[PDB]
Design a protein around this ligand. Structure first.
Ligand SMILES: CC(C)C[C@H](NP(=O)(O)O[C@@H]1O[C@@H](C)[C@H](O)[C@@H](O)[C@H]1O)C(=O)N[C@@H](Cc1c[nH]c2ccccc12)C(=O)O
Ligand SMILES: *[C@@H]1O[C@H](CO)[C@@H](O)[C@H](O)[C@H]1NC(C)=O
Ligand SMILES: *[C@@H]1O[C@H](CO)[C@@H](O)[C@H](O)[C@H]1NC(C)=O
Ligand SMILES: *[C@@H]1O[C@H](CO)[C@@H](O)[C@H](O)[C@H]1NC(C)=O
Ligand SMILES: [Zn+2]
Length: 696
């Protein structure tokens, strides 16, 4: 009664080669599940992290390279553009011959970069204004510095867009890096050195004198500036309640409550907003509704900015944009980023050009690239099987509502309502393959020159920003997908209340219409449950069936949610990560993801049990002395096999809201009675603690 098919032997060999049977499953399931893989692999010099997900990404890029590198006579314009963009990106000779020339041409359009400019105050300082300079970078290039103003979906009215004001991203991975000592010292040093290196290259190219001390003096001041801005930003832990972050105010209330004086101005929120919106010829009055996500940051900002000159501010502002462009310039410019990237990612080399390029055009033309990808690698008949798995897991979610003792009937009803309303998106939107007109029109305004990569990326920046700003008065498009098809990942959108499973993730180990169901439910089944459960985590639970930020929880049920969640906050907060130097994970920042993991795996298991009851046991896999309940958990764990570079581990423990793969495995299985039952784990064995967390 052993399956001897090609498909069964492929998956069995993979499972067998990845696992380490010499490790007791109940002592450490990550080692048991991934030990074979760990011993065989070493993180590539160009990778920050390596494992199942990254391997799948590398493989998807091979497909992209295959479909983009060769022109085909019957290619529609949309496809011709993606290939021309790809070609401009991989032509390093053409790029290298241009030096930093394309950047130099750009500088005057962003008020320059003081350090690499002679007499900046006379040239730009004369007509300079915080409102114009910040707006220029924001509206033409998408670079949000000092004050992040953007057009997005109204948290409280899903169908509309509204202007949002929030704190900006930083040059370093997170606000923590700015302590600049111990584990962060090399990063801060490399960052300032990086600033200095680029300023030096620009000066040498522009034929300007180079005073090393002056370069150091100016760049250290931008670091001093950003340190203050970093310290002023609110921690992620204080931004995890959607209800509290949402503060709708009029531009008048903003001008009144959040005064700012820069370079002796004062700051005009109306002028700043219009300097931005004018790009799309949209006028704003002081009566305009704005959602402020960082009122405290704006408040703390006032005293900070008065201590700095227009020159200091612009040195940081242009730097933040320039650091993102340097890798699109000649080799000399590319090399200046070496120490910085090693400090942040641990990588000693850049990823292959063709891979960075495939990724770049996939990210900028997701529908065009998605179309080629699915035609080359996705079997349309998979969509149906997946549709069915989703129907099954959604059902299991609803059924489980009855067993949950911590919620009252009224709240369970609304939870059921929300669950039923979840809209699924599987594989790719049929339109990208069947509607050539629409696909072409999406890229109509884009015209790529094969020998001008830099001009091409700048055009994409302007186009994407214009497209975004133009949405202010428009309604949110219902049929719009939140992800391209050639992506190895899955998502959940609170505002649209939808789950998306791109074609890129509908492949082994996650799914295959031909692999054993235990594997399917353990992989993609768990993924579907993860996404659905996001609609009910510490963030998602705050949004209703239509994606509106509104409370549908009774005070008691809301209170019980936090109590049940707290168990996971402490559980994960207690895991110490060796790669990150023994630091503990952030149980609060990873809460949502941990809830999704734990809820999702149980939901998938429940669904698998339903499948077995209704269909009977499956033929076992050859070479594995494990039954299907055990294979279910083995596959789930192998989805997460992987490892991290120390430098990137220090980065991800701060920036990744997901727990590292090994802890996603250990944490989830520790809370699973089904797992311990499947592997006969003794009580209190490492993988089977008496105390188990559970929310969904
Ligand atoms: C269950 C898994 C298949 C999908 C699941 N996606 P999900 O958490 O819904 O969503 C992800 O994280 C969110 C915080 C962001 O808002 C999303 O845009 C998305 O990046 C996840 O753990 N994604 C992780 C793991 C992962 C997916 N693709 C990867 C590629 C490389 C490395 C890791 C990954 C991530 O995005 O990191
Ligand atoms: C790269 O660009 C240069 C300059 O335009 C050109 O001579 C060369 O043909 C291009 N190489 C390829 C492979 O297209
Ligand atoms: C913004 O204010 C400046 C004065 O600093 C003015 O020159 C400019 O025209 C104003 N822009 C808009 C869009 O009102
Ligand atoms: C670790 O778990 C204990 C037990 O509940 C908890 O009291 C403590 O706060 C946790 N520590 C962290 C860092 O989460
Ligand atoms: Zn998630």
């Amino acid at each position: 009664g052993i399956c001897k098919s090609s498909d069964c032997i492929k998956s069995a060999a993979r499972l067998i080669q990845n696992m380490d049977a010499t490790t007791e499953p109940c002592t450490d399931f990550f080692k048991y599940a991934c030990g074979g893989w760990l011993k065989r692999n070493v993180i590539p010099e160009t990778s920050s992290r390596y494992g199942n997900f990254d391997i799948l990404r590398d493989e998807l890029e091979v497909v992209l390279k295959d479909v983009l590198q060769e022109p085909k006579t019957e290619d529609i314009v949309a496809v011709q553009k993606a290939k021309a963009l790809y070609r401009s990106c991989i032509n390093e000779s053409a790029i290298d011959s241009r030096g930093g020339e394309p950047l130099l041409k750009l500088l005057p359009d962003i008020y320059g970069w003081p350090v690499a400019t002679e007499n900046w105050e006379q040239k730009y300082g004369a007509s300079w204004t915080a409102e114009k300079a910040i707006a220029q970078l924001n509206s033409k290039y998408g670079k949000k510095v000092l004050i992040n103003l953007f057009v997005g979906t109204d948290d409280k009215n899903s169908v509309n867009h509204v202007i949002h004001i929030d704190q900006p991203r930083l040059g370093l991975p997170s606000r923590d890096y700015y302590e600049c000592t111990g584990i962060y010292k090399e990063a801060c040093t490399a960052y300032v050195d990086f600033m200095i290196s680029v300023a030096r290259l620009i000066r040498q190219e522009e034929r300007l004198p180079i005073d090393e001390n002056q370069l150091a003096l100016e760049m250290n001041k931008v670091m001093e500036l950003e340190k203050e801005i970093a310290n002023a930003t609110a921690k992620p832990e204080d931004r995890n309640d959607p209800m509290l972050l949402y503060n709708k105010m009029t531009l008048a209330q903003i001008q009144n409550n959040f005064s700012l004086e820069i370079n002796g101005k004062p700051f005009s929120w109306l002028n700043f907003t219009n300097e931005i919106m004018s790009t799309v010829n949209i006028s704003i009055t002081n009566e305009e509704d704005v959602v402020v996500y960082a009122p405290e940051y704006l408040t703390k900002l006032k005293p900070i900015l008065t201590k700095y000159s227009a020159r200091d501010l612009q040195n940081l502002m242009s730097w933040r944009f320039i650091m993102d462009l340097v890798s699109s310039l000649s080799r000399t410019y590319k090399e200046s980023r070496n120490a910085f990237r090693k400090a942040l990612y641990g990588t000693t080399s850049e990823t292959a050009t063709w891979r960075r390029c495939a990724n770049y055009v996939n990210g900028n033309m997701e529908n065009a690239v998605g179309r080629l990808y699915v035609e080359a690698a996705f079997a349309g008949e998979s969509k149906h099987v997946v549709e069915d798995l989703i129907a099954q897991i959604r059902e299991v979610f609803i059924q489980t509502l009855d067993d949950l003792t911590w919620m009252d009937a009224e709240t369970k009803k609304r939870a059921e309502e929300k669950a039923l309303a979840i809209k699924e998106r599987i594989g790719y939107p049929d339109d990208i393959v069947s509607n050539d007109n629409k696909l072409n029109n999406e890229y109509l305004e884009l015209n790529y020159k094969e020998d001008e990569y830099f001009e091409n990326i700048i055009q994409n920046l302007k186009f994407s920003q214009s497209k975004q700003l133009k949405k202010l008065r428009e309604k949110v498009d219902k049929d719009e997908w939140i992800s391209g098809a050639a992506v190895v990942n899955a998502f959940y959108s609170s505002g649209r209340n939808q789950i998306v499973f791109p074609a890129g993730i509908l492949q082994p180990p996650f799914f295959s219409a031909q692999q054993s169901n235990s594997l399917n439910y353990g992989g993609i089944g768990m993924v579907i449950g993860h996404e659905i459960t996001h609609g009910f985590d510490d963030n998602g639970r705050n949004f209703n069936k239509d994606g509106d930020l509104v409370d549908w929880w009774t005070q008691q049920s809301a209170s019980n949610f936090k109590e049940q969640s707290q168990c996971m906050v402490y559980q994960y907060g207690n895991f110490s990560w060796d790669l990150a130097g023994g630091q503990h994970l952030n149980g609060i920042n990873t809460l949502g993801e941990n809830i999704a993991d734990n809820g999702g795996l149980g939901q998938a298991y429940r669904a698998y049990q339903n499948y077995i009851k209704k269909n009977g046991e499956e033929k076992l896999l050859p070479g594995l002395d494990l039954n299907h309940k055990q294979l279910f958990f083995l596959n789930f764990a192998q989805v997460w096999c992987g490892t991290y570079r120390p430098e990137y581990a220090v980065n991800s423990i701060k920036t990744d809201v997901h727990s590292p793969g090994n802890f996603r495995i250990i944490g989830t299985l520790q809370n699973s009675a089904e797992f311990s039952e499947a592997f006969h784990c003794r009580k209190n064995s490492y993988m089977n603690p008496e105390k188990k967390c559970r929310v969904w």
